[PDB]
C-alpha cells in the first residue's frame, strides 16, 4: 500500500497500449478499405474511356 501507485502506473501504460493499438487498427482498417475504394473508383474511370 506504500507503492500501490507503482502497481497502478504499470497498469495505465498497458491501458494506454490498448488504445494505442485499438485506434491504430481502426485507422489502418479504414485506409485499406479507402485504398480499395481508391482503385475501384479509379478503375471505373479507366473503363469509361473506351466508350469514346
Amino acid at each position: 500500500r506504500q507503492d500501490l501507485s507503482a502497481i497502478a502506473r504499470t497498469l495505465q501504460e498497458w491501458c494506454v497500449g490498448c488504445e494505442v493499438v485499438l485506434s491504430g487498427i481502426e485507422e489502418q482498417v479504414s485506409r485499406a478499405n479507402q485504398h480499395k475504394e481508391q482503385q475501384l473508383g479509379l478503375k471505373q474511370q479507366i473503363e469509361s474511356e473506351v466508350a469514346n
Binding site: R31, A32, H35
Partner: protein, 173 residues
C-alpha cells in the same frame, strides 16, 4: 554537429557570388571541409580547379592540401603531422581540430575491426597518440593488453502497421 549546415553555405558561394573564382578563404574552407567529411575525390578535383593566381598567393591553402595527400596515401601518422603545422585561425583552425578527431575515431573503429592483435607502437601512430596515452586509452575500454611483446589486443565493437497495410492494399488493388 553544425559543420554540415555550414559546409552547405561554402559550396553555394562558389557558384553564387563570383563570375567564376570564389574568395581565397572560401577555397581554404571547402578543401578542409571535404577532408573533414572524408570526400577525397571532391578534395582532389577542388584543388585542380583553383587558378594558379590564388594558389601562389594563398600559400596556407597548400598546407591544407598537404593533409589531403596523407588521407589519400593513408599515412595516418602523416595526417597528424600535417594537421599540427599551419595556424589559419578564425577561418580554418576551428575545422582543423575537428578534422583530427574524425580521423582518429576512423582509425580506431578501423583498427578495432581490422586487427585481432596489433603492435602498440603501430597502434599508437595509426591513431596518433604516444605509446603511454595509447596503452592507457585502451585499458579504460577494457581491451586486452600484453607486456613484453608490446601487443594490444582489440575488442570488436501507427509506425509499423501503416507500412504493412500499404503492402497489403498495394498487392490487393
Amino acid at each position: 554537429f553544425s559543420f554540415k549546415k555550414l559546409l552547405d553555405q561554402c559550396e553555394n558561394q562558389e557558384l553564387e557570388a563570383p563570375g567564376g573564382i570564389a574568395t581565397p578563404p572560401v577555397y581554404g574552407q571547402l578543401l578542409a571541409l571535404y577532408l573533414l567529411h572524408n570526400d577525397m575525390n571532391n578534395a582532389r578535383y577542388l584543388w585542380k580547379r583553383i587558378p594558379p593566381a590564388i594558389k601562389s598567393a594563398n600559400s596556407e591553402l597548400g598546407g591544407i592540401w598537404s593533409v589531403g595527400q596523407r588521407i589519400w596515401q593513408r599515412d595516418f601518422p602523416g595526417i597528424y603531422t600535417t594537421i599540427n603545422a599551419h595556424q589559419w585561425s578564425e577561418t580554418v583552425q576551428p575545422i582543423m581540430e575537428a578534422l583530427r578527431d574524425a580521423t582518429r575515431r576512423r582509425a580506431f573503429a578501423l583498427v578495432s575491426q581490422a586487427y585481432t592483435s596489433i603492435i602498440a607502437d603501430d597502434f599508437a601512430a595509426f591513431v596518433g597518440l604516444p605509446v603511454e596515452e595509447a596503452v592507457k586509452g585502451i585499458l579504460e575500454q577494457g581491451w586486452q593488453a600484453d607486456s613484453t611483446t608490446r601487443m594490444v589486443l582489440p575488442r570488436k565493437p501507427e509506425q509499423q502497421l501503416a507500412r504493412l497495410t500499404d503492402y497489403v492494399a498495394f498487392l490487393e488493388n
